[PDB]
């Protein structure tokens, strides 16, 4: 059904418009081909759809900068626009296309339309401007245009609507989703400033659309992630179990609001376990598959924090974890195999769990050796390293170590490019380890620990 927009007639027919660049050999384009056809059939009249076989016309992709297949890109009236950042399924394409079809701000003409707009599953910014030529309306229009791909904008001039909202000019009100209503936080927040400014309105929405506990599930994904956050993952399907989702988000909301009144900065969020199941691996949470919500924290710096404790229905565990994090006691969770208590032997078995306890030790010089199991070089170096350890077990100030670098995330400035890499950290130089890239002989190792370590090595 779509037209093939080759180079010779590209700019002729590019003059909104959705064009997907594709390459026949790639399976990704063929996977969405029936989905793309269905989207074209479902979006006829609203937005035309087209296919481009880039393998023939190199000029189009060279000009458009299309280095991938597929790289669905929208062309607003023959003008390059932001690449389609969403699922390549037909439903998501249709949803985003209908979102693009409407103006920057939806002009509400009837009050019933106002309720229909504010009844949507996502937050909704509504402007009330009785005067059509008022500068507040124009500034709101530019604000809608700039932040269009992130928020649902609408405007209206109904006398009842304007009077029931601000009725003083720059009447910008944010209605949070109707399935996210709560008690401690007001559902509706009004814009309070002398003049409505596009930047000011954008900042106001950015700081007020989330409130305390938003339901971020594949939507607003970037708008929340990126700061010092706190995500509670749990079964989150409103159309089927809205009551449970409201219950758990209310628990998280009350604990978050208590600590916010206490006066600390920490954003919160609730997520569905299935949708973000890919992200559960990053926190080493596997798949709980239980009504109990798992809670995790990532900070702006990239630190990760996990509760081992069950999320109590009373909320004691939540506030306990919040005050622990604010104090800063729990260690960053890095993927680490359970360390054995039997760390005896010529070579000390170091894990990412106790890397700070062993390697980062202040009163000893440590020589660590990152090794991998399948590594043949590391298997060949293991017996000599063991003999080195048994020989230099008599030195109290120096201990050599090995940490598996595939099942235990390497912490500290320590970084491994090729196994097996060996590092030496002096007692008073825990911040500047030296990478021993010399020889690989036992005698060479003994010579090196004779050269560097202050305490005389033993035999």
């Amino acid at each position: 059904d779509v037209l093939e927009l080759t180079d010779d007639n590209f700019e002729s027919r590019i003059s909104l418009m959705l064009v997907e660049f594709f390459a026949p050999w790639c399976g990704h384009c063929k996977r969405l081909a029936p989905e793309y056809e269905a989207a074209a059939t479902r979006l006829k009249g609203i937005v035309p759809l087209a296919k481009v076989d880039c393998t023939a016309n190199t000029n189009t992709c060279n000009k458009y900068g299309v280095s991938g297949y597929p790289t669905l890109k929208i062309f607003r009236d023959g003008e390059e626009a932001g690449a389609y950042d969403g699922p390549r399924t037909a439903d998501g394409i249709v949803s985003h296309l209908k979102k693009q079809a409407g103006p920057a701000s939806v002009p509400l003409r009837t009050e019933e339309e106002f309720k229909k707009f504010i009844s949507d599953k996502d937050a909704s910014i509504v402007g009330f401007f009785d005067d059509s030529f008022s500068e507040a309306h124009s500034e709101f229009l530019k604000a809608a245009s700039n932040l269009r791909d992130n928020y649902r904008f609408a405007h209206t001039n109904v006398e009842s609507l304007v009077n029931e909202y601000d009725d003083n000019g720059e009447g910008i009100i944010l209605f949070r989703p109707s399935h996210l209503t709560n008690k401690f936080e007001d559902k509706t927040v009004a814009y309070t400033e002398q003049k409505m400014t596009s930047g000011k309105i954008k900042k106001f929405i950015q700081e007020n659309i989330f409130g305390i506990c938003p339901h971020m599930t594949e939507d607003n994904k970037d708008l929340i992630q990126g700061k010092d956050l706190l995500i509670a993952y749990y079964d989150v399907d409103y159309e089927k179990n809205a009551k449970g989702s409201n219950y758990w988000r209310n628990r998280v909301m009350m604990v978050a609001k208590k600590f916010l009144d206490a006066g600390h900065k920490l954003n919160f969020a609730v997520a569905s376990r299935k949708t973000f199941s890919h992200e559960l691996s990053d926190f080493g949470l596997e798949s709980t598959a239980g009504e109990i919500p798992v809670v995790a924290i990532r900070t702006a710096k990239g630190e990760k924090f996990v509760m081992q404790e069950e999320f109590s229905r009373d909320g004691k565990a939540l506030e306990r974890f919040l005050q622990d994090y604010f104090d800063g006691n729990l260690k960053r969770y890095l993927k680490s195999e359970p360390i054995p208590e039997s760390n005896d032997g010529p070579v000390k078995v170091v894990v990412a769990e106790n890397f700070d306890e062993i390697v980062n030790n202040e009163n000893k010089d440590v020589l660590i050796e990152f090794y991998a199991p399948w590594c043949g070089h590391c298997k060949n170096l293991e017996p000599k390293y063991k003999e080195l350890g048994e020989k230099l077990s008599k030195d109290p100030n120096i201990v050599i170590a090995k940490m598996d670098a595939t099942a235990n995330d390497v912490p500290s400035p320590y970084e491994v490019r090729g196994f097996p890499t060996i590092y030496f950290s002096p007692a008073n130089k825990k911040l500047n380890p030296k990478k021993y890239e010399g020889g690989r002989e036992l005698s060479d190792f003994i010579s090196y620990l004779q050269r560097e370590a202050t305490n005389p090595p033993v035999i």
Binding site: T181, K240, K243, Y247, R313
Partner: protein, 364 residues
């Protein structure tokens, strides 16, 4: 008797070697290591490996118009050829014997052509309107070292019959197994499949109706939807029983849509007489035959040609083909088996010698 050849050194007087190429192979009169008779099985044989050959014999010009033409010859692949040919070619009077190149102007080619396992078929090609036409049928040609008879018969009714070892192996008409006039019946291009002619026929509700029983709600409250005691509807607004997909959900109401109802069969475009059809009864006819040639490339020489016959009577050629090939074949096969037994005895002796030498080396 259009042509006769039994090789019973005078054959060099009636056989002539072309000079088109400076590397043409040399033919030798021989009967091979094994045969049915020392003198009766004498014939031309290739004696140079991986070289081209070109040998032609002139004879009284004659035409095949209105009369049956029969060709008959015996080929022996004693050397166990891997790549080569035993085919022969009929050339008109205008053909130059001394200038016969790889592909000279000929009328009919008949005989085996074997070059590897994939190709093991009789190549019979005819000239018509300045074109070499092969047969569409896959005629298999014998590959063992024994002598194998090959015979072609073409009657003036554009019919052909190919025989191997006096036994019928193929028969038919020239205007039906070749590409003389390939348009015979053409499907009508405008005969598109009608919209009412269903191919994948399916009828809804043949012996069923809307059940209205499977039309259950998509989501029903969970049977074990027990509210938690710690839940406060005052703070939670309004607790509700969780709902899940009911086990009784089905695909709406399908009234057993079965196939093959009122099926008229697969539609096809009806065929009509092609206006481009133009077979000719004189397709089998030729102006004149003047030369019998054999230009073939053989990687492993040792192919013996004998018992050449070109005539007009099927019974005549059949009788001489029998009285030559069948008489040869017996003594050929028994003697061959005798020398094969001798060879196997020699190989067993060599194997025993190798084994005893190996044992002696082991003892040291």
């Amino acid at each position: 008797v259009y042509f006769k050849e039994q090789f019973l050194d005078g054959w060099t007087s009636r056989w002539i070697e072309s000079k088109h190429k400076s590397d043409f192979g040399k033919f030798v009169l021989s009967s091979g290591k094994f045969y049915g008779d020392e003198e009766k099985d004498k014939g031309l044989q290739t004696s140079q490996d991986a070289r081209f050959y070109a040998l032609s014999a002139s004879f009284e010009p004659f035409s095949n118009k209105g009369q049956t033409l029969v060709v008959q010859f015996t080929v022996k692949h004693e050397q166990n050829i891997d790549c080569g040919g035993g085919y022969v070619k009929l050339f008109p009077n205008s053909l130059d014997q001394t200038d016969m190149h790889g592909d000279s102007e000929y009328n009919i080619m008949f005989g085996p052509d074997i070059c590897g396992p994939g190709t093991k078929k009789v190549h019979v090609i005819f000239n018509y309107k300045g074109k070499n036409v092969l047969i569409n049928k896959d005629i298999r040609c014998k590959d063992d070292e024994f002598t194998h008879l090959y015979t072609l018969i073409v009657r003036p009714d554009n019919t052909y019959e190919v025989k191997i070892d006096n036994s019928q192996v193929e028969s038919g008409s020239l205007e039906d197994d070749w590409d003389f006039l390939p348009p015979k019946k053409i499907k009508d291009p405008d005969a598109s499949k009608p919209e009412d002619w269903d191919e994948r026929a399916k009828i809804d509700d043949p012996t069923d109706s809307k059940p209205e029983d499977w039309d259950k709600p998509e989501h029903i409250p969970d049977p074990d939807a027990k509210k938690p005691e710690d839940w406060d509807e005052e703070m939670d607004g309004e607790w509700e029983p969780p709902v899940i997909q009911n086990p009784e959900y089905k695909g709406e109401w399908k009234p057993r849509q079965i196939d093959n109802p009122d099926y008229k069969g697969t539609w096809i475009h009806p065929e009509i007489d092609n206006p481009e059809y133009s077979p000719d009864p004189s397709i089998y006819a030729y102006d004149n035959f003047g030369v019998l040639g054999l230009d073939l490339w053989q990687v492993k020489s040792g192919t013996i040609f004998d018992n050449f016959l070109i005539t007009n009577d099927e019974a005549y050629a059949e009788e001489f083909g029998n009285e030559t090939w069948g008489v040869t074949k017996a003594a050929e096969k028994q003697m061959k088996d005798k020398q094969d037994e001798e060879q196997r005895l020699k190989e067993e002796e060599e194997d025993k010698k190798r084994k005893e030498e190996e044992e002696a080396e082991d003892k040291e």
